[PDB]
């Protein structure tokens, strides 16, 4: 034995003592030994000499060490040593380290944070082990031990170390469940180590480093460069982890407004920060997102997520919406700033389903345009600073920063200021759908969710003349509307259904006939652009089936034709465009959607409506 033992006292350059341990642990045959070994191992000076000198790269490891030394232990069946006793012997020694080392507080954490994520290994394995009342009670001492350990660090001076810091911050967040309210409580009347856990995710070399790390920007990642990625920087393993550790602290702190709003802004420059860098670094991940910097890119996102939401749900906490309006869109500015730069990443899972995601966004949304309108113009100007045709078709970050913006616009077009609205969003939009740039091609795959949302855009902006905003020139306003309804009109139909679906098509229907027909400052404007609308329509649905489509949303719009006219189209519609259909399946359908829009008329307007079901009856066997 002792060969190993005193080379643990002294090591040289190349020996790999924590590799030995979780060699020699299961297979030691005597149990003092287990004791003697951890006692020697607590005295090993690569990891426990000065604190001023330790490395967070060679103690992190003793932490998944001892995860793997007590759950393969568990595990041997029929050991000449069993369990109990093996771990009774290795907590004899991490007690006996306690009372005798002023220093055992940091020494010990990862080893304790390793037994206690051991224990649900066990349950996979067995859950009635036939000495299992010492095993509690060695469990109960590791749990015990390790608060008197993070409270002692803490209050010791120590955790002004930046790498014992992140050594501890780690090993809690692996621990999270074990760590009871009152410790933390009590340790952040002594030190408070949240602005530390956001610092470790996001800037930190032992973190994401503000995005500094060459292999995110390697098109082709080995899983060996990956590996001792994740070996140089051991935050990466754990980046959840650590959104929770700090999701559970926030919550648990009593400090003043004024330094928890100032706690608020650092988190958000440093995580705005990362972000941005993060942006300039990327142009495509690789399809899989289940390994390697897709997973990563992936988590981080998650993280960046739970710590917003626990930053807006504490700030709600104070309950007084004078807060609100005077501090949220500031806050908010920062926020969508983070989701513009990591949308990529969104896209990739889905932004409906994901009850976190919408809870900030919206939250910040709601909040921007309740309290200050002039923010969300500006993100809109910034946003569209930083795009260009030759990054679009580069680049999937640009080209979600792109569908975030538009999604943007869509929400704020019809409230927003004149000059956002005509000298900025609708020449965008207007050029993306007409494909005007000949940089790019706007109907390639790639660009799919940027022309739908382009679309989604240009309606909203119809919908500007019902809303009620001062600093907007309505007449303008209604004028360019009038001007460019019809077009898109057309356009629509053109691009209806090789570009756009039924559903898409159905939409743009129901919304500009709404916009052009009466109890409307459209129609009040100019009757004749309804005129226009029915002529244009009409006369494509002369040129499942596209036509069958067609006519079906034609006959859609009738209960909004006046009185003068109604029984007119209804004519229209059945003598030449129903009955001049030569199949019955398709001429039954149309006839069945000719009822339903008298049925619909009705539910609209009874008198109209009336008028409809004699033309009916009169017509219509």
């Given at each position: 034995?002792?060969?190993?033992?005193?080379?643990?006292?002294?090591?040289?350059?190349?020996?790999?003592?924590?590799?030995?341990?979780?060699?020699?642990?299961?297979?030691?045959?005597?149990?003092?030994?287990?004791?003697?070994?951890?006692?020697?191992?607590?005295?090993?000076?690569?990891?426990?000499?000065?604190?001023?000198?330790?490395?967070?790269?060679?103690?992190?490891?003793?932490?998944?060490?001892?995860?793997?030394?007590?759950?393969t232990k568990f595990k041997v069946s029929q050991p000449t040593v069993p369990f109990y006793r093996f771990y009774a012997a290795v907590l004899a020694s991490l007690l006996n380290c306690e009372k005798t080392d002023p220093s055992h507080h940091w020494k010990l954490i990862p080893i304790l944070t390793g037994v206690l994520l051991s224990i649900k290994g066990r349950d996979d394995v067995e859950l009635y082990p036939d000495h299992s009342r010492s095993i509690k009670g060695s469990d109960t001492a590791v749990a015990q031990?390790?608060?008197?350990?993070?409270?002692?660090?803490?209050?010791?001076?120590?955790?002004?170390?930046?790498?014992?810091?992140?050594?501890?911050?780690?090993?809690?967040?692996?621990?999270?469940?074990?760590?009871?309210?009152?410790?933390?409580?009590?340790?952040?009347?002594?030190?408070?180590?949240?602005?530390?856990?956001?610092?470790?995710?996001?800037?930190?070399?032992?973190?994401?480093?503000?995005?500094?790390?060459?292999?995110?920007?390697?098109?082709?990642v080995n899983s060996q460069s990956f590996d001792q990625l994740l070996n140089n920087n051991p935050a990466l393993k754990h980046l959840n982890r650590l959104s929770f550790l700090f999701e559970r602290t926030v919550k648990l702190n009593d400090g003043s407004i004024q330094s928890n709003l100032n706690d608020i802004d650092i988190s958000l420059n440093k995580m705005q920060s990362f972000s941005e860098k993060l942006s300039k670094k990327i142009s495509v991940l690789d399809d899989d997102s289940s390994k390697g910097v897709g997973q990563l890119l992936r988590q981080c996102l998650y993280a960046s997520i739970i710590i917003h939401q626990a930053i807006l749900t504490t700030f709600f906490q104070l309950d007084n919406a004078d807060y609100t309006k005077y501090?949220?869109?500031?806050?908010?500015?920062?926020?969508?700033?983070?989701?513009?730069?990591?949308?990529?990443?969104?896209?990739?899972i889905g932004t409906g389903g994901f009850q976190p995601y919408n809870f900030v966004y919206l939250t910040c949304l709601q909040g921007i345009i309740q309290y200050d309108m002039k923010t969300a113009e500006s993100l809109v100007k910034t946003f569209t600073t930083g795009i260009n045709y030759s990054s679009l078709k580069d680049s999937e970050v640009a080209r979600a920063k792109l569908l975030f913006t538009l999604n943007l616009m869509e929400q704020?077009?019809?409230?927003?200021?004149?000059?956002?609205?005509?000298?900025?969003?609708?020449?965008?939009?207007?050029?993306?759908?007409?494909?005007?740039?000949?940089?790019?091609?706007?109907?390639?795959?790639?660009?799919?969710?940027?022309?739908?949302?382009?679309?989604?855009?240009?309606?909203?902006?119809?919908?500007?003349?019902?809303?009620?905003?001062?600093n907007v020139d309505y007449e303008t306003n209604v004028t360019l509307v009038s001007e460019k309804i019809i077009p898109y009109l057309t356009l629509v139909i053109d691009q209806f259904p090789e570009f756009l679906s039924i559903?898409?098509?159905?939409?743009?229907?129901?919304?500009?006939?709404?916009?052009?027909?009466?109890?409307?400052?459209?129609?009040?404007?100019?009757?004749?652009?309804?005129?226009?609308?029915?002529?244009?329509?009409?006369?494509?649905?002369?040129?499942?089936?596209?036509?069958?489509?067609?006519?079906?949303?034609?006959?859609?719009?009738?209960?909004?034709?006046?009185?003068?006219?109604?029984?007119?189209?209804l004519s229209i519609a059945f003598y030449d465009l129903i009955v001049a259909t030569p199949e019955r399946t398709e001429r039954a359908f149309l006839q069945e959607r000719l009822w339903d829009c008298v049925v619909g008329t009705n539910k609209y307007d009874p008198q109209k409506g009336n008028l409809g079901i004699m033309w009916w009856y009169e017509n219509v066997n």
């Open positions: 034995l002792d060969y190993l033992l005193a080379e643990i006292i002294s090591p040289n350059e190349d020996t790999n003592v924590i590799g030995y341990l979780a060699y020699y642990y299961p297979k030691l045959k005597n149990e003092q030994n287990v004791a003697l070994l951890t006692d020697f191992f607590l005295r090993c000076p690569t990891y426990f000499s000065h604190s001023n000198v330790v490395s967070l790269r060679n103690n992190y490891p003793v932490m998944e060490a001892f995860n793997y030394i007590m759950t031990l390790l608060q008197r350990c993070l409270l002692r660090f803490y209050q010791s001076g120590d955790a002004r170390s930046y790498d014992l810091n992140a050594l501890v911050i780690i090993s809690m967040s692996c621990a999270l469940d074990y760590v009871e309210d009152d410790t933390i409580k009590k340790i952040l009347y002594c030190f408070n180590y949240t602005r530390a856990i956001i610092d470790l995710i996001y800037y930190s070399p032992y973190g994401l480093n503000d995005s500094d790390i060459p292999l995110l920007s390697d098109s082709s501090f949220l869109p500031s806050f908010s500015r920062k926020i969508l700033s983070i989701l513009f730069n990591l949308f990529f990443i969104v896209d990739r704020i077009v019809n409230i927003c200021s004149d000059d956002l609205r005509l000298e900025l969003i609708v020449p965008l939009v207007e050029d993306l759908v007409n494909n005007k740039n000949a940089c790019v091609d706007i109907h390639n795959h790639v660009f799919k969710s940027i022309f739908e949302s382009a679309h989604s855009v240009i309606l909203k902006f119809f919908t500007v003349v019902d809303s009620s905003v001062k559903n898409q098509l159905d939409i743009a229907i129901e919304t500009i006939s709404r916009t052009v027909f009466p109890d409307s400052p459209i129609y009040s404007y100019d009757k004749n652009i309804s005129s226009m609308f029915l002529n244009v329509l009409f006369n494509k649905c002369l040129t499942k089936s596209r036509r069958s489509a067609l006519i079906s949303a034609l006959i859609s719009v009738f209960p909004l034709i006046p009185v003068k006219d109604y029984t007119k189209w």
